[PDB]
């Protein structure tokens, strides 16, 4: 375990999940006289750390999540990145060590949360910052000893993502097919069922009950099937793609943030293939050979950080920018395009949001409550209608009649159905930010 | 992979389960021109090998189990040890290589099946015999990176096998306690439930449904909980014992074969502890520190081999003895006391069994159909009653009224309730065999 410098250092730590990096390492530091803060992306994990420490080691840590903060007075504190951020980052002289667990995490809260530690830790009196992860950036899918990988060809009856699955390969036994969209699943399952196979689609919503615990079955699922479920699969056929939130600078008039099918990750190909080979030999068929390493993320994620600093943490775009610059400036972490100045300038021209609309979108929990609450604000002041009436724009429901005219489009979040103008003063500010 | 000698050799092979030792190794041998026979203890595994080979490699092996034998003409044949034995062992010039998979298996059929290959393989024209296993004899439980081991003390409220479980350690979260007997489970669960915990007993019979997939729960199970079930356990408390079939030369009048609680195995302690530490850090509490290595078996298992040669395979005790002597004479396999001459002599004096009683016990599928069918034979001829009326002695049901007198005890298989004599001519033959 990295030693505490006399001044301040940023160390990396790569160890398996559950091997002690988030419990026993911190317990040893404490035994040394240090006050330790361990940050993690999930509340279940965090809560889980507190259960282990006190029953295996007799240590009752302070546990801080967005629901409650539990303080016992222990020199170790487990917190969520979001709670950490909500708590305003580093508090002078509180900790000597700060372990940023799952530092490879590409969700906005982890990124901003880590950029924050990096930026504020030394000033706060911290002598050591640990970047702990079991999935280092740039990781690739490596060969698996219990699994045979066979490339799908164009030879097969069932067509599948440009390639084809020969029927004999799935008629008989328990197989799992990974489709990128719930509709694809519905389409393939009905196609296989039609052909004579026991085929069931699965995704977010249904219950695992839908999968027979035994008997030949051909599951056609999305990543909604937790890698923990798994029911004796002789093979796994992967489409090798997934849908992700992406930003497009489409100049229509500004940028677009939507969900798009993108080539899969080393972490995705490994997790999907990982459902075979347990207890016996498995088979993995794919459409394309691995290519994308882990640890890369979309600029739209940077947009999410500014939105979150604006909507939840009381940070001006410049403050967010410094926190994020510290992250982008620390090596060994996931990477993205350097779009800081751009997103900063944008959020900067988004003045005078309606705090009632903002308070509304936050509470609903959907993505980009700021950008959503801000398009609504612009819509109301112009008695214009929202881009559409998707539940995304429901903060503007109580006034649909009041609203008429084209929509004054600032940017495109998801799909638009109403007519639109691109002359609003703010649409132009952002257009001017574009590039 | 071991190379085929010009004459004949016995090689060992230690590789993980599913790593290719039972599929890809054989596929390479075949590609070399060899005819390969792969023997395995389970029909599911065997059938499983045939599914993999043909869908991953295009090889349709001959698959032989006790239900049916499927022949395609492939140079690879997967068979069960029992079917192999039923088939009469090695057939001259059939195979060049014979892989005895799961060679560490201590069930009678595996042992006799392997002793048979060893004894007959070279004569049959086989140039190589492979002893493949992923659990080599003498194996010990090694430290686990994701699991913390904490020894139970005498301090705790809940008493447990001479030691004690402190309640705080299991009140809250998901725990699993391994009890050695279904009644122990019933007793502890009711004890914990009484104390205020969500505690459910589990064993052979009930349905896993009885375990809540979520919520604090304290499962008190026996090894009936397949290591595949596992439902997010923060800890595992192991009693460190198990019940096993053992022979006792109790001289009352002869020997006794019963189920008895014996210190656990390295394979048992590893499998039980293995239910924590998945996806996170686990805790394992035990009553005693590991001690018994894998690969040792009871002499009663040798009795089972003679019984099986007598009841199923048409082998005289001397023939069984030579097959078993080959096994006991090959190093790198599980071990037992050298009790060959003893069990041979015994089964040797068991002449003229009633083939109707024998045919009856075989069909029922219980243990020692020969020894059971032989005590019955002795009982009927003496119009005496069976040791008891446990379903064990049901071949003698259709005549309970006809039967009266003390039971003429040859040996004790399980429990006896009827009165008994020890003067029968065969009881004495066996007494004379004793030592």
Swiss-Prot record, chains A, B:
Binding site for ATP: 15-22
Co-factor(s): Zn(2+); Mg(2+)
Membrane topology: Peripheral membrane protein
Cofactor annotation comment: Binds 1 zinc ion which has a structural role. The magnesium ion is essential for the helicase activity.
Catalytic activity: Hydrolysis of four peptide bonds in the viral precursor polyprotein, commonly with Asp or Glu in the P6 position, Cys or Thr in P1 and Ser or Ala in P1'; a ribonucleoside 5'-triphosphate + H2O = a ribonucleoside 5'-diphosphate + phosphate + H(+); ATP + H2O = ADP + phosphate + H(+)
UniProt: Mg(2+) 1 binding residues: 22, 102
Motif DECH box per record, residues: 101-104
UniProt domain Helicase ATP-binding: residue ranges: 2-154
Source taxon at top rank: Viruses
Location of this chain's protein in the cell: Host endoplasmic reticulum membrane
Chain intervals for the UniProt region annotation (RNA-binding): 271-282
Domain description: The N-terminal one-third of serine protease/helicase NS3 contains the protease activity. This region contains a zinc atom that does not belong to the active site, but may play a structural rather than a catalytic role. This region is essential for the activity of protease NS2, maybe by contributing to the folding of the latter. The NTPase/helicase activity is located in the twothirds C-terminus of NS3, this domain contains the NTPase and RNA-binding regions.
Quaternary structure (record): Interacts with protease NS2. Interacts with non-structural protein 4A; this interaction stabilizes the folding of NS3 serine protease. NS3-NS4A interaction is essential for NS3 activation and allows membrane anchorage of the latter. NS3/NS4A complex also prevents phosphorylation of host IRF3, thus preventing the establishment of dsRNA induced antiviral state. Interacts with host MAVS; this interaction leads to the cleavage and inhibition of host MAVS. Interacts with host TICAM1; this interaction leads to the cleavage and inhibition of host TICAM1.
Function: Displays three enzymatic activities: serine protease with a chymotrypsin-like fold, NTPase and RNA helicase. NS3 serine protease, in association with NS4A, is responsible for the cleavages of NS3-NS4A, NS4A-NS4B, NS4B-NS5A and NS5A-NS5B. The NS3/NS4A complex prevents phosphorylation of host IRF3, thus preventing the establishment of dsRNA induced antiviral state. The NS3/NS4A complex induces host amino acid transporter component SLC3A2, thus contributing to HCV propagation.
Designated name of the protein: Serine protease/helicase NS3
Annotated organism of origin: Hepatitis C virus genotype 1b (isolate BK)
Organism taxonomic ancestry: Viruses, Riboviria, Orthornavirae, Kitrinoviricota, Flasuviricetes
């Amino acid at each position: 375990p990295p030693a505490v410098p006399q001044t301040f250092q940023v160390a990396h730590l790569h160890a398996p999940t559950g091997s002690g990096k988030s419990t026993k390492v911190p317990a040893a530091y404490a035994a040394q006289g240090y006050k330790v803060l361990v940050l993690n992306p999930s509340v279940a994990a965090t809560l889980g750390f507190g259960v282990y420490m006190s029953k295996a080691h007799g240590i009752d840590p302070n546990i801080r999540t967005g629901v409650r903060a539990i303080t016992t007075g222990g020199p170790i504190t487990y917190s969520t990145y979001g709670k950490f951020l909500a708590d305003g980052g580093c508090s002078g002289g509180a900790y000597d060590i700060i372990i940023c667990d799952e530092c490879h995490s590409t969700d906005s809260t982890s990124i901003l949360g880590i950029g924050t530690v990096l930026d504020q830790a030394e000033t706060a009196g911290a002598r050591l910052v640990v970047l702990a992860t079991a999935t280092p950036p740039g990781s690739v899918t490596v060969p698996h000893p219990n699994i045979e990988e066979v490339a799908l060809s164009n030879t097969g009856e069932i067509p599948f993502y440009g390639k084809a699955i020969p029927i004999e390969v799935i008629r008989g036994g328990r197989h799992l097919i990974f489709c990128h969209s719930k509709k694809k699943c519905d389409e393939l399952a009905a196609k296989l069922s039609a052909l004579g196979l026991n085929a069931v689609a699965y995704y977010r919503g249904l219950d695992v009950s839908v999968i027979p615990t035994s008997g030949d079955v051909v599951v056609v699922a999305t990543d909604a099937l937790m890698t923990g479920y798994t029911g004796d699969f002789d093979s796994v056929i992967d489409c090798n793609t997934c849908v992700t939130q992406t930003v497009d600078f489409s100049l229509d008039p500004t940028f677009t943030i939507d969900t798009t099918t993108v080539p899969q990750d080393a972490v995705s190909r490994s997790q999907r293939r990982g459902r075979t080979g347990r207890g016996r030999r498995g088979i993995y068929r794919f459409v394309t050979p691995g290519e994308r390493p882990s640890g890369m993320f979309d600029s739209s994620v940077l947009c999410e950080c500014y939105d979150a600093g604006c909507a939840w943490y009381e940070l001006t775009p410049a403050e967010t920018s410094v926190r994020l610059r510290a992250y982008l400036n620390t090596p060994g972490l996931p990477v993205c395009q350097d779009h800081l100045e751009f997103w900063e300038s944008v959020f900067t021209g988004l003045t005078h949001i309606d705090a009632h609309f903002l308070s509304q979108t936050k509470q609903a929990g959907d993505n980009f409550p700021y950008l959503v609450a801000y398009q609504a604000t612009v819509c109301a002041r112009a008695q214009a209608p929202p881009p559409s009436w998707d539940q995304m724009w429901k903060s503007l429901t109580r006034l649909k009649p009041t609203l008429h005219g084209p929509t004054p489009l600032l940017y495109r979040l998801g799909a638009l159905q109403n007519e639109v103008t691109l002359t609003h003063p703010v649409t132009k500010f952002i257009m001017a930010c574009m590039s």
